[PDB]
Design an enzyme around this catalytic site. Structure first.
Site, short mmCIF file in Angstrom:
data_model
loop_
_atom_site.label_atom_id
_atom_site.label_comp_id
_atom_site.label_asym_id
_atom_site.label_seq_id
_atom_site.Cartn_x
_atom_site.Cartn_y
_atom_site.Cartn_z
N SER B 14 0.81 -1.22 0.00
CA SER B 14 0.00 0.00 0.00
C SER B 14 0.85 1.29 0.00
CB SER B 14 -1.03 -0.02 1.12
OG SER B 14 -1.81 -1.20 1.05
N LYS B 17 1.39 1.93 -5.51
CA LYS B 17 1.72 1.32 -6.79
C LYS B 17 0.67 1.61 -7.83
CE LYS B 17 2.34 -2.84 -5.22
NZ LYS B 17 2.23 -2.30 -3.82
N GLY B 18 -0.62 1.52 -7.44
CA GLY B 18 -1.75 1.76 -8.31
C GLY B 18 -1.69 3.12 -8.96
N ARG B 142 -2.88 -29.84 -8.29
CA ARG B 142 -2.74 -30.40 -9.63
C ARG B 142 -3.52 -31.69 -9.78
NH1 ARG B 142 2.88 -31.22 -9.26
NH2 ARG B 142 2.30 -30.78 -7.10
N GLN B 187 1.45 -6.15 -3.58
CA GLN B 187 1.89 -6.34 -2.21
C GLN B 187 3.18 -5.55 -1.92
OE1 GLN B 187 0.08 -10.62 -1.98
NE2 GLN B 187 1.75 -10.64 -3.49
N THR B 202 3.05 -12.65 2.93
CA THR B 202 2.15 -13.12 1.89
C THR B 202 2.62 -14.51 1.38
OG1 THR B 202 0.79 -12.48 0.08
CG2 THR B 202 3.09 -11.88 -0.12
N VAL B 264 -8.65 -3.99 1.99
CA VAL B 264 -9.54 -5.15 2.16
C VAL B 264 -10.44 -5.03 3.40
CG1 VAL B 264 -9.56 -7.67 2.62
CG2 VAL B 264 -8.20 -6.78 0.71
N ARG B 269 -4.77 0.82 9.34
CA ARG B 269 -3.45 0.44 8.89
C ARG B 269 -2.47 0.74 10.01
NH1 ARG B 269 -4.21 2.98 3.04
NH2 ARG B 269 -4.68 1.08 1.85
N1 LIG Z 1 0.34 10.31 -1.49
C1 LIG Z 1 -0.88 9.88 -1.14
N2 LIG Z 1 -1.55 10.55 -0.18
C2 LIG Z 1 -2.73 10.07 0.25
N3 LIG Z 1 -3.36 8.95 -0.14
C3 LIG Z 1 -2.68 8.31 -1.11
C4 LIG Z 1 -1.47 8.71 -1.67
N4 LIG Z 1 -1.05 7.79 -2.63
C5 LIG Z 1 -1.99 6.87 -2.60
N5 LIG Z 1 -2.99 7.11 -1.69
C6 LIG Z 1 -4.07 6.21 -1.29
O1 LIG Z 1 -3.54 5.26 -0.39
C7 LIG Z 1 -4.26 4.01 -0.51
C8 LIG Z 1 -3.29 2.87 -0.66
O2 LIG Z 1 -2.77 2.81 -2.00
P1 LIG Z 1 -3.01 1.53 -2.94
O3 LIG Z 1 -4.13 0.68 -2.49
O4 LIG Z 1 -3.09 1.90 -4.41
O5 LIG Z 1 -1.61 0.81 -2.78
P2 LIG Z 1 -0.77 -0.23 -3.64
O6 LIG Z 1 0.67 -0.01 -3.38
O7 LIG Z 1 -1.12 -0.15 -5.13
O8 LIG Z 1 -1.32 -1.62 -3.06
P3 LIG Z 1 -0.90 -3.11 -2.65
O9 LIG Z 1 -0.09 -3.23 -1.47
O10 LIG Z 1 -2.26 -3.80 -2.48
O11 LIG Z 1 -0.16 -3.72 -3.80
C9 LIG Z 1 -5.29 4.22 -1.62
O12 LIG Z 1 -6.58 4.45 -1.06
C10 LIG Z 1 -4.71 5.40 -2.41
O13 LIG Z 1 -5.65 6.16 -3.16
N1 LIG Z 2 -0.86 -3.60 2.35
C1 LIG Z 2 -0.96 -4.83 1.82
N2 LIG Z 2 -0.86 -5.89 2.61
C2 LIG Z 2 -0.91 -7.06 1.93
C3 LIG Z 2 -1.07 -7.26 0.56
N3 LIG Z 2 -1.01 -8.61 0.25
C4 LIG Z 2 -0.80 -9.19 1.42
N4 LIG Z 2 -0.72 -8.31 2.47
C5 LIG Z 2 -0.34 -8.57 3.87
C6 LIG Z 2 -1.51 -8.71 4.83
C7 LIG Z 2 -0.91 -9.61 5.90
O1 LIG Z 2 -0.08 -8.85 6.78
C8 LIG Z 2 -0.02 -10.54 5.09
C9 LIG Z 2 -0.65 -11.85 4.66
O2 LIG Z 2 -1.72 -11.54 3.75
P1 LIG Z 2 -2.39 -12.46 2.71
O3 LIG Z 2 -1.46 -12.45 1.54
O4 LIG Z 2 -3.66 -11.77 2.31
O5 LIG Z 2 -2.61 -13.81 3.29
O6 LIG Z 2 0.38 -9.79 3.92
C10 LIG Z 2 -1.18 -6.08 -0.28
O7 LIG Z 2 -1.27 -6.05 -1.50
N5 LIG Z 2 -1.12 -4.91 0.46
N1 LIG Z 3 12.39 -35.39 -14.76
C1 LIG Z 3 11.87 -34.65 -13.77
N2 LIG Z 3 10.56 -34.61 -13.61
C2 LIG Z 3 10.18 -33.80 -12.58
C3 LIG Z 3 10.99 -33.07 -11.72
N3 LIG Z 3 10.22 -32.28 -10.89
C4 LIG Z 3 8.98 -32.51 -11.26
N4 LIG Z 3 8.89 -33.42 -12.29
C5 LIG Z 3 7.71 -33.85 -13.07
C6 LIG Z 3 7.20 -35.23 -12.74
C7 LIG Z 3 5.74 -35.10 -13.16
O1 LIG Z 3 5.61 -35.22 -14.59
C8 LIG Z 3 5.40 -33.68 -12.73
C9 LIG Z 3 4.81 -33.52 -11.35
O2 LIG Z 3 5.83 -33.85 -10.37
P1 LIG Z 3 6.00 -33.33 -8.89
O3 LIG Z 3 6.56 -31.93 -9.02
O4 LIG Z 3 6.88 -34.21 -8.11
O5 LIG Z 3 4.59 -33.23 -8.28
O6 LIG Z 3 6.65 -32.95 -12.81
C10 LIG Z 3 12.41 -33.16 -11.91
O7 LIG Z 3 13.27 -32.56 -11.27
N5 LIG Z 3 12.76 -33.97 -12.98
MG LIG Z 4 -3.32 -1.89 -1.15
#
Ligand SMILES: Nc1ncnc2c1ncn2[C@@H]1O[C@H](COP(=O)(O)OP(=O)(O)OP(=O)(O)O)[C@@H](O)[C@H]1O
Ligand SMILES: Nc1nc2c(ncn2[C@H]2C[C@H](O)[C@@H](COP(=O)(O)O)O2)c(=O)[nH]1
Ligand SMILES: Nc1nc2c(ncn2[C@H]2C[C@H](O)[C@@H](COP(=O)(O)O)O2)c(=O)[nH]1
Ligand SMILES: [Mg+2]
Ligand SMILES: Nc1ncnc2c1ncn2[C@@H]1O[C@H](COP(=O)(O)OP(=O)(O)OP(=O)(O)O)[C@@H](O)[C@H]1O
Ligand SMILES: [Cl-]
Ligand SMILES: [Mg+2]
Lengths: 343, 343
Positions: B14, B17-18, B142, B187, B202, B264, B269
């Site tokens: 956050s 990036k957006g 898978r 993230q 994450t 989310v 925060r």
């Molecule tokens: N400089 C700023 N001042 C105030 N609010 C801002 C600024 N830049 C961004 N924001 C706001 O902060 C919030 C967080 O930003 P955003 O969700 O886009 O983050 P991100 O880096 O793209 O996300 P993620 O971690 O999910 O990848 C948004 O609501 C956005 O509009």
């Molecule tokens: N700010 C932010 N936090 C994230 C994002 N993706 C994951 N997280 C954080 C929330 C939790 O602290 C941790 C585990 O989250 P999750 O990936 O949703 O299981 O990572 C993201 O895009 N933005």
């Molecule tokens: N030859 C070879 N096959 C692999 C290797 N890792 C995964 N595979 C192949 C075997 C199966 O076709 C498929 C799924 O295997 P697994 O990653 O073990 O769940 O990937 C590797 O290092 N060598």
């Molecule tokens: Mg965000």
């Protein structure tokens, strides 16, 4: 920066990455060898003297004469038993001036629970059923009460890895302090979770981007990508997935070769004709600088010389300046030829 | 081939990036915008006219005047309902000459099952509990009988995404055909699965290597990394993890700012002082070429000018030539300043 040589597989795995890793480690003398292996991947290196290293945990590059660091990336899924064994087997190489660094978030394989979780997919998708993904999933759960999945937590009650488990800072510093790095990818391009054979694929992408991510290697550190290929790509035995439109499944008897097996399960590897489509696909995303074309010993000179030209034009077509620099005619160091010497 | 501008977050998410994604999309006119978002990530872009895009699925870069392709990476975890809503809300930008490409292996979020699966971690690790990892885990299973997790399979019975779901070939070709790509990371660096806050993190690495891997972007395609930061990094509310040794948790009242509420959860925060350690860590692995320093509106000129110098020396220290090129003083396009213009 630009000091990382990353070995990646251009096909479905078992192309001889262990061999090119050990060969390049001996030739280039990397001080740091790194990987992010999961137990699905066995890697074999045989040196000039006939010494064999079959590794599931440790990089094959531990054979590097200038070895200072052995690094097991965060994407690693490993059996501590196997690691112990592997360290023991190469304790001569893994001397007091060699630091083994296990990334704190490297996953400790629960051999019973994780292999048992993959019994189904071991038949359904022909999975190695090594617990790779079950271990990975347990790690992804991010349950704070779970102190048994990441190396950092396991090190607290399992002292075997305690000296090896580093912090994320030590990890970064170890890479920063490295002079020349050998990054060893596992599995194969076409096995990538996000390649077209899903669900007949592995649990991650087997791409340079993913392997560098899994070893925590910053992208500027990448110097070279040595892509590996077989003249006849293989798959594991069973219902392990389809192939590309330009390739056909072959038999080991059709090749006049001894049936290749998965070492422990003894499942007969599936074998296919070379795929140009697979090569363009692998060339496009893997973008190797160098190519190791292995199992040239299964074809006549015209056959493997043809695959060399195919790989290089498949490369060129996907904006890749890949050069087949190495040719493999056997499993040992002595069997790795410089392409310029044999053609 | 270097045509991908990848936006990554240098802190705990956050950071805006957006905003930089939408700003750069409008400034640079990328024909291709790409991401690999999971529902845990909500990205906000507000343009000069006050139009807001709060995106959980679509890149914010869809605001690019030369938009040809919108690409949802294989690492994507998305609600089809949310995707449809965001397409609907931007149907003017997503005309007939705009191809929306959903990677065949992009994960379709099962809103009921996946969010239910993350209720525990939504409190335990302060997880957004959006189903991101539960969806990811189902994909990793898978199971060949599971035709309901990947976009490719879901497209066969859910016609809403059928036209958008491409093949892996179309995916590669769409990237190859692209002139200039905006890759949008989600993230934050410190939220990376393999950063030091595990399990308070994450489900994946939030690193350029992982982001490129999750969008299937070949590494040579990377042109530049725009790292994003806040002057005061935030975390989501709850027991969302620790902070760095050089940073302290602050209150919004301490900053003289209206309490920011999580994208989310409506939860307040968590806000921290700037961390130089975090910056060096993010600089080391993320290696940004450019830095967007946002929320400069929360500090006096001396305060944010200081963080600019800190970021650039934190960069230099980690062999990174990062230049704070952009400064954010608000949530809209108009609030993005060129650093050279304000200091
Ligand atoms: N400089 C700023 N001042 C105030 N609010 C801002 C600024 N830049 C961004 N924001 C706001 O902060 C919030 C967080 O930003 P955003 O969700 O886009 O983050 P991100 O880096 O793209 O996300 P993620 O971690 O999910 O990848 C948004 O609501 C956005 O509009
Ligand atoms: N700010 C932010 N936090 C994230 C994002 N993706 C994951 N997280 C954080 C929330 C939790 O602290 C941790 C585990 O989250 P999750 O990936 O949703 O299981 O990572 C993201 O895009 N933005
Ligand atoms: N030859 C070879 N096959 C692999 C290797 N890792 C995964 N595979 C192949 C075997 C199966 O076709 C498929 C799924 O295997 P697994 O990653 O073990 O769940 O990937 C590797 O290092 N060598
Ligand atoms: Mg965000
Ligand atoms: N050219 C060759 N001819 C014959 N056998 C070879 C040749 N090159 C390697 N081998 C053997 O064939 C197998 C190749 O698999 P190996 O584990 O070394 O490959 P890999 O690419 O590291 O596999 P993985 O997919 O697990 O990453 C090994 O048993 C190895 O000893
Ligand atoms: Cl630019
Ligand atoms: Mg093998």
């Amino acid at each position: 920066m630009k000091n990382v040589d990353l070995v990646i597989d251009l096909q479905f795995g078992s192309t001889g990455k262990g061999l090119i890793a050990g060969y390049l480690a001996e030739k280039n003398g990397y001080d740091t060898v790194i990987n992010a292996n999961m137990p699905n991947a066995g890697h074999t290196y045989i040196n000039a003297e006939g010494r064999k290293w079959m590794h599931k945990v440790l990089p094959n590059g531990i054979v590097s004469p200038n070895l200072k660091r052995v690094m097991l990336g965060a994407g690693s899924v490993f059996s501590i038993n196997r690691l112990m064994e592997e360290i023991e087997m190469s304790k001569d190489l893994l001397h007091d001036k060699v630091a083994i660094l296990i990334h704190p978030m490297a996953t400790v394989l629960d051999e019973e629970a994780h292999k048992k979780a993959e019994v189904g997919i071991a038949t359904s998708i022909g999975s190695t059923g090594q617990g790779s993904m079950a271990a990975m999933v347990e790690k992804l759960q991010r349950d704070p009460t779970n102190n048994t999945i990441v190396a950092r937590d396991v090190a607290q009650y399992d002292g075997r890895i305690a000296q090896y488990v580093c912090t994320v800072e030590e990890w970064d510093m170890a890479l920063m302090a490295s002079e020349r790095i050998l990054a060893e990818g596992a599995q194969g391009f076409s096995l990538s979770l996000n390649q077209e054979f899903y669900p007949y694929c592995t649990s991650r992408d087997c791409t340079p981007a993913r392997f560098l991510a899994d070893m925590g290697i910053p992208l500027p550190m990448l110097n070279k990508v040595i892509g590996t290929a077989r003249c006849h790509p293989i798959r594991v035995g069973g219902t392990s997935g389809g192939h590309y439109p330009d390739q056909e499944e072959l038999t080991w008897e059709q090749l006049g070769q001894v049936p290749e097996l998965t070492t422990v399960t003894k499942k007969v590897r599936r074998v296919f004709s070379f795929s140009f489509i697979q090569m363009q696909k692998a060339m496009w995303t893997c973008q190797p600088d160098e190519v190791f074309l292995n199992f040239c010993n299964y074809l006549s000179p015209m056959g493997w010389q043809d695959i060399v030209h195919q790989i290089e034009v498949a490369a060129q077509s996907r904006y890749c300046d890949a050069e087949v620099k190495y040719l493999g005619f056997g499993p040992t160091f002595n069997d790795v030829e410089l392409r310029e010497d044999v053609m």
